[PDB]
């Protein structure tokens, strides 16, 4: 499957001029475009090599569309300020998520538009792609609006054609990338500890994409409980690393095994210290 997700960020900043506006888009799990306000020359630029396959009109087109949006929001920050009854002396945030997904058959599986005011759901279009779900009375206001204005109707078309259609191009503009797969290199490390016990650590490094799964088992069953774990992290060179550890009775080290599941690993990996 594949997706096209645009992440919107609007943040007002008292006594510091117009709200800051950021537009970041991701294909599957890759940043292919960016648009910042504060930046010297706010040009909706590319973050992917393969995005060179777009003439100066795409750029120019998407940059105006953006400057437009940037404006609708400053108004929305003001709109919301009115709804909730909050002063002009407070910093606030608007968060939107627009995009769509297609299956092996490029046929749209799920599309959506989700909002968040100050780090909390504000409103979001339903799977039905025709009705909305509001978080608070404020959203209701907007819902009332968008209902008569048939917004969900207009957003239904975007997700089916427009989006899915652009989501086709891009994929072709850089298939030899958004399809690559790097195999998680794994190993274990021994570490001494107080009152005699030991910490076996399982490493996975330089893998891609990002979701991989690391788990420890003991004589068959997973120790999904009583095993430390870190959030998958980025090395910095397009790759990701992550590890999982567990405390085991010194001497009785071998009775444990580490399992690595990843879309690059045809078969899950088995490790041991």
């Amino acid at each position: 499957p594949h997706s096209l997700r645009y992440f919107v960020t609007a943040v007002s900043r008292p006594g510091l001029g117009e709200p800051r506006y950021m537009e970041v888009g991701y294909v599957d799990d890759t940043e292919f475009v960016r648009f910042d306000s504060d930046a010297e020359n706010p040009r909706y630029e590319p973050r992917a090599r393969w995005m060179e396959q777009e003439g100066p009109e795409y750029w120019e087109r998407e940059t105006q569309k953006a400057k437009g949006n940037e404006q609708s929001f400053r108004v929305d920050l003001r709109t919301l300020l009115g709804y909730y009854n909050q002063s002009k002396g407070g910093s606030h945030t608007i968060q939107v998520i627009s995009g769509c997904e297609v299956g092996s058959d490029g046929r749209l599986l799920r599309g959506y538009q989700q909002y968040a005011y100050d780090g909390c759901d504000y409103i979001a279009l339903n799977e039905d792609l025709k009705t909305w779900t509001a978080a608070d009375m404020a959203a209701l206001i907007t819902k009332h609006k968008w209902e008569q204005a048939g917004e969900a109707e207009r957003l239904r078309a975007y997700l089916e054609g427009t989006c899915v259609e652009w989501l086709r191009r891009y994929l072709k503009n850089g298939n030899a990338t958004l399809l690559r797969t790097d195999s998680p290199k794994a190993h274990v490390t021994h570490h001494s500890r107080p009152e005699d016990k030991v910490t076996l650590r399982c490493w996975a490094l330089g893998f891609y994409p990002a979701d991989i799964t690391l788990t420890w088992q003991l004589n068959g069953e997973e120790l999904i409980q009583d095993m430390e774990l870190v959030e998958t992290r980025p090395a910095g060179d397009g790759t990701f690393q992550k590890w999982a550890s567990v405390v085991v009775p010194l001497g009785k080290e071998q009775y444990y095994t580490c399992h690595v599941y990843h879309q690059g690993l045809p078969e899950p990996l088995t490790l041991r210290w």
């Binding site: 645009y6 919107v8 949006n69 108004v75 709109t79 909002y115």
Partner: peptide, 8 residues
Amino acid sequence: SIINFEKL
């Protein structure tokens, strides 16, 4: 090509 946003 991000869609263009309707006001809240």
